Amino acid sequence: QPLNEEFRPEMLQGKKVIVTGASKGIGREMAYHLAKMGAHVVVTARSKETLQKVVSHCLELGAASAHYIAGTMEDMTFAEQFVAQAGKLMGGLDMLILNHITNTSLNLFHDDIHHVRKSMEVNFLSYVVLTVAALPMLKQSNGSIVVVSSLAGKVAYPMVAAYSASKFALDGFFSSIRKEYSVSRVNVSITLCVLGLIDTETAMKAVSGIVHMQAAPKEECALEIIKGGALRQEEVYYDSSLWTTLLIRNPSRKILEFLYSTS
Amino acid sequence: QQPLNEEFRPEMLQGKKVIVTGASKGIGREMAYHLAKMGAHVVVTARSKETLQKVVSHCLELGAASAHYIAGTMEDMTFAEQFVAQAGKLMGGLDMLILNHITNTSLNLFHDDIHHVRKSMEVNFLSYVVLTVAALPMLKQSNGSIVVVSSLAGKVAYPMVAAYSASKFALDGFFSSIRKEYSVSRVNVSITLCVLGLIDTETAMKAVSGIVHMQAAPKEECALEIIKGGALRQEEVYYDSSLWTTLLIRNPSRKILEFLYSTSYN
Amino acid sequence: QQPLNEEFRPEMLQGKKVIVTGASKGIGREMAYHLAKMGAHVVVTARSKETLQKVVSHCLELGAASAHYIAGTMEDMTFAEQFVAQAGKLMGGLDMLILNHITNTSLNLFHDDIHHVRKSMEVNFLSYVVLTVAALPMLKQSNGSIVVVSSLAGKVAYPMVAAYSASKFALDGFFSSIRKEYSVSRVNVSITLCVLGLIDTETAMKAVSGIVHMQAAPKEECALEIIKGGALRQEEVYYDSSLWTTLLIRNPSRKILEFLYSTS
Amino acid sequence: QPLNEEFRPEMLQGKKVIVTGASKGIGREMAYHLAKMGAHVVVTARSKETLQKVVSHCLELGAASAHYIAGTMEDMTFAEQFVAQAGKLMGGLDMLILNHITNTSLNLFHDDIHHVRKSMEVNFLSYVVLTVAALPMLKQSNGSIVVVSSLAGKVAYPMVAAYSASKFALDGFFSSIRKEYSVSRVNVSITLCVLGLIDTETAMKAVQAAPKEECALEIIKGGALRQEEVYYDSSLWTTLLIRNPSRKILEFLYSTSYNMDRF
Numbered sequence A: 001q002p003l004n005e006e007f008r009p010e011m012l013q014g015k016k017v018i019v020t021g022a023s024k025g026i027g028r029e030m031a032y033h034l035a036k037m038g039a040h041v042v043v044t045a046r047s048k049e050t051l052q053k054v055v056s057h058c059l060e061l062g063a064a065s066a067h068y069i070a071g072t073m074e075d076m077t078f079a080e081q082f083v084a085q086a087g088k089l090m091g092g093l094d095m096l097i098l099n100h101i102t103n104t105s106l107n108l109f110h111d112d113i114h115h116v117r118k119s120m121e122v123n124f125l126s127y128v129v130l131t132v133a134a135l136p137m138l139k140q141s142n143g144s145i146v147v148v149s150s151l152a153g154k155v156a157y158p159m160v161a162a163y164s165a166s167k168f169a170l171d172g173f174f175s176s177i178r179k180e181y182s183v184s185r186v187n188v189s190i191t192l193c194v195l196g197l198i199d200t201e202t203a204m205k206a207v208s209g210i211v212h213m214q215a216a217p218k219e220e221c222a223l224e225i226i227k228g229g230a231l232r233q234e235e236v237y238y239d240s241s242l243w244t245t246l247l248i249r250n251p252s253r254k255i256l257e258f259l260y261s262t263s
Numbered sequence B: 001q002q003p004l005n006e007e008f009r010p011e012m013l014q015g016k017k018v019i020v021t022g023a024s025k026g027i028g029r030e031m032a033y034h035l036a037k038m039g040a041h042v043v044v045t046a047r048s049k050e051t052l053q054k055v056v057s058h059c060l061e062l063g064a065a066s067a068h069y070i071a072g073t074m075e076d077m078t079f080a081e082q083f084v085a086q087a088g089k090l091m092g093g094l095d096m097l098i099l100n101h102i103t104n105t106s107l108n109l110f111h112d113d114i115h116h117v118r119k120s121m122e123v124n125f126l127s128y129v130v131l132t133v134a135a136l137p138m139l140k141q142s143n144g145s146i147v148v149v150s151s152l153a154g155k156v157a158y159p160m161v162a163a164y165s166a167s168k169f170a171l172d173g174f175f176s177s178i179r180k181e182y183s184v185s186r187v188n189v190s191i192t193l194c195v196l197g198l199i200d201t202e203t204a205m206k207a208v209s210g211i212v213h214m215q216a217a218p219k220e221e222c223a224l225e226i227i228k229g230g231a232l233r234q235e236e237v238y239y240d241s242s243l244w245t246t247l248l249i250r251n252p253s254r255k256i257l258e259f260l261y262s263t264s265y266n
Numbered sequence C: 001q002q003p004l005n006e007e008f009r010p011e012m013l014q015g016k017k018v019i020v021t022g023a024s025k026g027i028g029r030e031m032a033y034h035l036a037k038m039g040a041h042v043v044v045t046a047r048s049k050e051t052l053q054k055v056v057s058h059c060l061e062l063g064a065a066s067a068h069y070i071a072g073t074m075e076d077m078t079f080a081e082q083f084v085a086q087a088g089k090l091m092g093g094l095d096m097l098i099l100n101h102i103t104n105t106s107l108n109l110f111h112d113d114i115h116h117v118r119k120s121m122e123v124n125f126l127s128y129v130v131l132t133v134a135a136l137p138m139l140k141q142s143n144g145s146i147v148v149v150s151s152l153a154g155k156v157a158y159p160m161v162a163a164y165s166a167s168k169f170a171l172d173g174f175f176s177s178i179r180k181e182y183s184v185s186r187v188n189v190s191i192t193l194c195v196l197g198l199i200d201t202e203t204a205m206k207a208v209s210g211i212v213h214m215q216a217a218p219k220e221e222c223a224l225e226i227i228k229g230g231a232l233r234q235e236e237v238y239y240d241s242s243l244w245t246t247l248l249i250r251n252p253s254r255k256i257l258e259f260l261y262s263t264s
Numbered sequence D: 001q002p003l004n005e006e007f008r009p010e011m012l013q014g015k016k017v018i019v020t021g022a023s024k025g026i027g028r029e030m031a032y033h034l035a036k037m038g039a040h041v042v043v044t045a046r047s048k049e050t051l052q053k054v055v056s057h058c059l060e061l062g063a064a065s066a067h068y069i070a071g072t073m074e075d076m077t078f079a080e081q082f083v084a085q086a087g088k089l090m091g092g093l094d095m096l097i098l099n100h101i102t103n104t105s106l107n108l109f110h111d112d113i114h115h116v117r118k119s120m121e122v123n124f125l126s127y128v129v130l131t132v133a134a135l136p137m138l139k140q141s142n143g144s145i146v147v148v149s150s151l152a153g154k155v156a157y158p159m160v161a162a163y164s165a166s167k168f169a170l171d172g173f174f175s176s177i178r179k180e181y182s183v184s185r186v187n188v189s190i191t192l193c194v195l196g197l198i199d200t201e202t203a204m205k206a207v208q209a210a211p212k213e214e215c216a217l218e219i220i221k222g223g224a225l226r227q228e229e230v231y232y233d234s235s236l237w238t239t240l241l242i243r244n245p246s247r248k249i250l251e252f253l254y255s256t257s258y259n260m261d262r263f
Ligand SMILES: NC(=O)C1=CN([C@@H]2O[C@H](COP(=O)(O)OP(=O)(O)OC[C@H]3O[C@@H](n4cnc5c(N)ncnc54)[C@H](OP(=O)(O)O)[C@@H]3O)[C@@H](O)[C@H]2O)C=CC1
Pocket: A020, A021, A022, A023, A024, A025, A026, A027, A044, A045, A046, A047, A048, A050, A071, A072, A073, A074, A098, A099, A100, A101, A102, A103, A122, A148, A149, A150, A151, A195, A196, A197, A198, A199, A200, A201, A202, A203
């Protein structure tokens, strides 16, 4: 059940939020928006020097508190330990923003099992490890899980097959536990964010010469992810095309989920 | 891909070289029997050495051009890679790869079972990728087909099967994206994704015991519809007891979006 | 149009001035009863004065702010125009126009019955247009609502009801086109199209007897669902036993095409 | 049940065809294509002077025969008598092409009920009267009914409300009788043509505009091939979005819940 209210930046004031993949791009823009809202933030990514700079800017913007923990989400021990440390720094957890992805470029799939497994481990499995480690704190606070996904996580997309598989897996996993939490009365919301092309340095470089469309602003995108999570909405759609929002919706899937629940 | 604009006939499988994974029992075993009756060459796999021998003997009795088994676990990526090479040598090539095995799954609330999530991802998804890579040179030689067995839980959220659902959704994203790559790269290997509802296999029936459920569809007809879709090079096959579910779960809006996004790249 | 970004509550109809056509029986009668319970002012119409009298009696008892009837045939475009003016006088204005009447129809294959095709177009479609023209000045003053009752046969082809299907499809074409016109001309009058499946009315139960084997949804909740759609200023609403009927409304491909073409 | 053959102009050789609204625009272009194919043509519209020039040009183009019968489709007695006359002259009827409309300009609906009624009578009711009159001859030849419609006959369009109502009515009526014919074994095909903006003198004055000559040939093709729907527009994105597969699936599923054996 989402909040039938309009978003207010005050909803995040004093909230204890983790943002992963927060050294750059959308993740960094989220940490900044949260800081301006006066949230307590714990940021993570591999790059410690850039995470240092992010935390310092968060404090300038007005974050209630800001800390970083550096490590790779390839390392499942780090993922589990990071949540416990982040929780101890803030005295709890209200929102878990799962955003990091392994480095990926546009290429036809041929024999690249390494990139398929790496995408699955980093983009999907670590999200599950982080969720398990965070849930006790989120159940205590009636908190929220925010999962960053893509158009390639809802429809087939050539040149990003391993990435698409990892994003599709997030939908299957997180949408299925959302139904389980509903019937078991676990009051932790799950927001799946479906994004189109965003003007991050990573995406702009990856798509240069190959895919040409725009390219919605990263600042506005980060805010839409936070708003959807704050409002406990099931899904957020953020793309520059009006065709997307209308056609991406799946009432047929929603009908089937309702019909197969009464069994 | 472009499907074959014709009616299926069992002679389409006569002398064809087919791998069936997860073929010691359930739908996989039924598929092996259908292919044997059609006069195909079959190489079956699963872990169960003894039941695989029995399935192989019955396949020969039904009319298989040839039938052999290779036992092993698809948790082992080395076995998956070696199995394809050996199946290929046994038949002298490969025309159709039917990816059907799954790891053991029950209906349970997800709590902290990362081990089951990882094992489902490894067996149900990654091993199908490894098998495809190993089989691809032979399939490109024969203008062959990959048949991927999936579920309603691979298209919509289903509670109590989160890890299974995640792995079946992953198959869709992977296989559908490479299908788009093959169409533009002119790789004449078809990819068929099969979306099944509840089927009366011993595994599923035991799994749904203790729960109210809809009518389970028959495993023999199910297995035949999977082969038909693959033989006809169709993109997707839907098979469920309900005609309403079968026809309405198919997503033309997604197909429209895929077409729209395709115009924005080179 | 912009729908009400809020949950429906029966107090939304309190003191509202509502016309309900085809309200002597079936869904129209149930809608009058719901509005009566909500404290609305109601004016009911149909051809039968005796049955309309019984409806008004129950409405007054249920707690309607005021309840009246005007008997006449919607085959007569002069009666249609005059009925609205007279209904507006009885209430001192108009907030909601619920178009629900249809001409008598049975299930049959189409052969040479042009009379039934014409009568269906006149009663089920043309009179709705005449009633709308007559109501619009009052609706414009109150920022009112038009509610149009339609069917599965108004969104898909339906054998045995071809003349009926043609009239319901006509309502969609006409009312959906004027809704686009009201958005450009900035007319703050909402238009709601209601897509209904089989409802347990005496008429439909008799008409489907031995032909259709399907679950008939209840008229009481059907009636409230129509009222809610109008009260929330929603463009399209549905009511049927099957959840799959949702696919007949809010069609995304149709919305994109409409957006595309208007901007050109 | 469409003919699974490629179109060939010989399919219309010696066929007995009625074309309504054939003195100008699309109708005139259809009359000309049918003439080049060596069909027997009977054309109609109100204006004898323009119909005379169409007939003369049809004969020059190679028509097996070409004649006109002038009248208004506002008159239902004329509509019924016209079909009897045209069919008695040709010695039968293989195809009925219903193309005429009442004169219409782009305007907001402005209490002009007279225009709504005339559009319904001419654009819709006369098509039903023409069908009833033609049905016995069409049953004898296993013939075809071709109904010319519009994008405004499938989606809402401001400024053509009366026109849209009448085109939507054609869809409901003709698509419902096609389903009745299918079960009653009436071997008369019904083709609904959904046209976008065409470069006719009328449309160009009233308003990317598709050519009228290719439009006319596409209508004939779909009718000859017994297709249920023909879509013709300059934009490939329009042709993609105009289809409604959910509607066709639901029509089939609803058919499983009724028994028509009584009729
Ligand atoms: N940009 C776009 O067009 C779109 C983006 N998205 C989604 O938005 C999210 C962010 O995208 P975007 O900001 O463009 O990407 P960026 O590459 O800009 O940032 C990804 C972040 O993840 C971190 N990261 C990378 N590898 C690891 C690792 N092994 N362990 C831990 N952290 C890691 C990176 O930092 P560091 O290198 O310091 O570790 C970085 O902070 C993703 O989930 C993506 O799928 C969805 C649709 C489109």
